[PDB]
C-alpha cells in the first residue's frame, strides 16, 4: 500500500545481489540472509496489520529455516577453502 | 572341484529360502478369500 | 510485448504499408536483443569496446530480417490482386532468409536454407484462419 512499496524495492535489490557475482563467493550467502530479512518484514506486516493470531507463528518458523540454509550451505563454503586457497566463483573446474 | 576357498552361497539357506516359499502361500489364500467376498457382496447388492 | 504483436495483424486488412514497415523493426529488434543477451554469457573480452561489438552484429541483422519481410509482403500485395495468401508470404519469406548470406562471404547457408526459412515464415500466416491455434484453454 505505502510501506510495502519500499520493502518490495528492497527485495529486488537483494534478488539481483544473488544473481550478481564478481570474484568473491561470500556475497551470495550474505544476500541469502538479506532476502530472508526482506521476506521477514513483508510477512510480519501482513499478519500484524490484518490480524490472524494463529498465523503469527508462521514467520517465527520461517526465521528458523532461514538460518538452516544459511548454515548448511555456509558449511560448504569452508570446504572450498580446504580444497582451494581462497573462495572464488572464478575458480571452478566443472564443465 | 567342489568349489574351493568357500562359496558365497552354499545353496540351502532355509532361513531365507523357507520364508520366501512361505510368503507365496500367505498371498494365495489372501487373494481368493477377498475374491469370494467380492462376489458375495456383488450378489447381495444386485 | 504482446500489444506490439497484436498491431501487426490489423494493418494488412487495408492497403496502407507506410506505418506497417515501422512496426516490423520493433518485432525483429526486440527478438534480436534476446539472443544478444544470451551471447554475453560467452565471456566478452575487455569492457564496452568489444561488449557493444557483439551486441551490434546480432541486433542489426535480426532487425533487417523483419524490416525486409514487412516491405516484400506489401510489394507482393500491391502487384496483382488477392489480399492474403500463404503463397504471397512465401515470396517474402525467401527474401528474409536471403540476407543471411550477406552476413558471411560463403553465398550459401542462408540461401541453402532459403526454402526452409521461407516455409516457416509462411506457416505464421497459415494460422490466420480458425484452423490453427498456438495456445488454447478448452
Amino acid at each position: 500500500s505505502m510501506v510495502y512499496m519500499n520493502i518490495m524495492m528492497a527485495f529486488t535489490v537483494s534478488l539481483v545481489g544473488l544473481l550478481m557475482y564478481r570474484s568473491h563467493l561470500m556475497s551470495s550467502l550474505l544476500c541469502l540472509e538479506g532476502m530472508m530479512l526482506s521476506l521477514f518484514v513483508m510477512a510480519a506486516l501482513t499478519i500484524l496489520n490484518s490480524h490472524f493470531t494463529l498465523a503469527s507463528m508462521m514467520p517465527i518458523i520461517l526465521l528458523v529455516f532461514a538460518a538452516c540454509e544459511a548454515a548448511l550451505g555456509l558449511s560448504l563454503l569452508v570446504m572450498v577453502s580446504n580444497t582451494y586457497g581462497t573462495d572464488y566463483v572464478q575458480n571452478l573446474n566443472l564443465l | 572341484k567342489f568349489y574351493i576357498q568357500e562359496p558365497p552361497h552354499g545353496s540351502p539357506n532355509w532361513l531365507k529360502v523357507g520364508l520366501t516359499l512361505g510368503t507365496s502361500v500367505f498371498l494365495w489364500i489372501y487373494l481368493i478369500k477377498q475374491h469370494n467376498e467380492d462376489v458375495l457382496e456383488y450378489k447381495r447388492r444386485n | 510485448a504482446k500489444t506490439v504483436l497484436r498491431q501487426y495483424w490489423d494493418i494488412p486488412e487495408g492497403t496502407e504499408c507506410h506505418r506497417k514497415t515501422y512496426a516490423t523493426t520493433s518485432i525483429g529488434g526486440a527478438a534480436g536483443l534476446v539472443v544478444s543477451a544470451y551471447s554475453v554469457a560467452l565471456k566478452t573480452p575487455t569492457s564496452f569496446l568489444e561488449g557493444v561489438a557483439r551486441t551490434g552484429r546480432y541486433t542489426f541483422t535480426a532487425a533487417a530480417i523483419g524490416a525486409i519481410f514487412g516491405l516484400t509482403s506489401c510489394i507482393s500485395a500491391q502487384v496483382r490482386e488477392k489480399p492474403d495468401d500463404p503463397l504471397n508470404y512465401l515470396i517474402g519469406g525467401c527474401a528474409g532468409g536471403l540476407i543471411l548470406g550477406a552476413r558471411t562471404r560463403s553465398y550459401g547457408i542462408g540461401a541453402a536454407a532459403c526454402a526452409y526459412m521461407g516455409l516457416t515464415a509462411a506457416l505464421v500466416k497459415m494460422g490466420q484462419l480458425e484452423g490453427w491455434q498456438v495456445f488454447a484453454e478448452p
Partner: protein, 314 residues
C-alpha cells in the same frame, strides 16, 4: 543391505598384533620369499607371492586356467627373452599389477573381518619399482607409462592404509650370480642392467614409504635368514604417526565394503583408454569368452553349477 547394528563390527577383536607386514623389493632373486615363511611365527596367516596365474589361484574352483584362458600371451618365461613389437612387454605387467591388487584386497578383507596378522610377499607398493627398471632400457614405450600412472592414482588412494610393517632387503650388485645358481633355467641369463636399476629404484621407494611414517627395517645378506631377530624387531617397534591409525566407525566400514567384493575392487583397474600393448581386439575377445563359458570350472558361475557341484534347485 549392510548390517552394522549387529554384533559384527569394525575395530572389535582386531588391531592387537594383527597389522599387515610386507617383504617387498628385494631384487630379481627370491630372497624375501624364504624369510617371509619363517616370519609367520607371530602372524596367523601367510600369503604366497603373486605371478601370472595369481588371480586364478583361488577365484572360483581350485585349479588355475590354462595359458590362453587366463590371459592372452602371459608367461614369466616369455619376459626373460623379451621381444619388441607384438608380444607381452607391458600387458603382462598390467596383469601382474591387477593380480597383486586383487590379493591385497582379500588379505585386507581377511584382516578386517576376524583380526589376524597377514604377511604379504611383494605388495602393490612395489610394482612401480619393477616397471621403472625395464623402462631404463629399450623395452617399454613412453605412452604405456602414462597408462600405468593413471591406474596408479585411482586404485591406490581408495585403500586407506599402505603397510604398517615394511621389510626392504638390499643385496650385493653381484646378485646375478645368485640367480644363476637357482634351480630355474628359464629365469637364468637375465640382463644385469635391469637388476641394477631395480636396486636403484628401490632406494627411491623406501624413502617415500618412510615419509608416510611407515615402519621400515633394513636387513643385509649377512643379517638375512633369521627368525628370532626379525620377530623381536617388529614386536619392539611401535606404530606411530602412520595413516593406519584411522576412524573406527566411519573409515573402517567404508574400506571394508570395497575389499569384500572382488568385482568392485577391480572395477577401477580396467581403463577405458586404448593402448597397443593392451589387446583391444574384439574378435579375439569373443572366442575367449566362448572358451571360458565352455570350461568345466566356472561356466554358469556363482555357487550353483551343473556337472561340478549341484546340491539343490531352489
Amino acid at each position: 543391505x549392510x548390517x552394522x547394528x549387529x554384533x559384527x563390527x569394525x575395530x572389535x577383536x582386531x588391531x592387537x598384533x594383527x597389522x599387515x607386514x610386507x617383504x617387498x623389493x628385494x631384487x630379481x632373486x627370491x630372497x624375501x620369499x624364504x624369510x617371509x615363511x619363517x616370519x609367520x611365527x607371530x602372524x596367523x596367516x601367510x600369503x604366497x607371492x603373486x605371478x601370472x596365474x595369481x588371480x586364478x589361484x583361488x577365484x572360483x574352483x581350485x585349479x588355475x586356467x590354462x595359458x590362453x584362458x587366463x590371459x592372452x600371451x602371459x608367461x614369466x618365461x616369455x619376459x626373460x627373452x623379451x621381444x619388441x613389437x607384438x608380444g607381452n612387454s607391458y600387458r603382462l605387467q598390467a596383469w601382474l599389477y591387477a593380480s597383486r591388487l586383487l590379493q591385497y584386497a582379500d588379505a585386507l578383507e581377511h584382516l578386517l573381518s576376524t583380526g589376524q596378522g597377514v604377511v604379504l610377499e611383494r605388495s602393490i607398493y612395489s610394482d612401480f619399482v619393477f616397471l621403472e627398471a625395464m623402462y631404463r632400457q629399450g623395452f617399454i614405450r613412453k605412452q604405456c607409462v602414462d597408462h600405468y600412472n593413471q591406474v596408479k592414482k585411482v586404485t591406490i588412494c581408495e585403500y586407506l592404509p599402505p603397510h604398517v610393517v615394511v621389510y626392504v632387503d638390499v643385496p650385493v650388485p653381484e646378485v646375478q650370480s645368485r640367480i644363476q645358481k637357482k634351480g630355474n633355467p628359464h629365469e637364468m641369463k637375465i640382463t644385469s642392467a635391469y637388476l641394477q636399476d631395480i636396486e636403484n629404484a628401490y632406494k627411491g621407494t623406501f624413502l617415500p614409504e618412510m615419509s608416510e611414517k611407515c615402519e621400515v627395517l633394513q636387513y643385509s645378506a649377512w643379517e638375512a635368514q633369521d627368525a628370532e631377530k626379525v620377530v623381536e624387531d617388529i614386536e619392539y617397534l611401535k606404530y606411530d604417526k602412520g595413516p593406519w591409525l584411522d576412524q573406527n566407525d566411519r573409515n573402517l566400514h567404508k574400506l571394508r565394503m570395497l575389499v569384500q567384493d572382488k568385482l568392485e575392487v577391480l572395477n577401477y583397474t580396467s581403463i577405458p583408454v586404448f593402448l597397443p600393448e593392451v589387446t583391444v581386439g574384439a574378435h579375439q575377445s569373443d572366442q575367449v569368452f566362448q572358451e571360458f563359458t565352455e570350461l568345466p570350472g566356472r561356466k554358469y558361475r556363482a555357487g550353483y553349477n551343473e556337472d561340478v557341484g549341484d546340491k539343490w534347485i531352489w
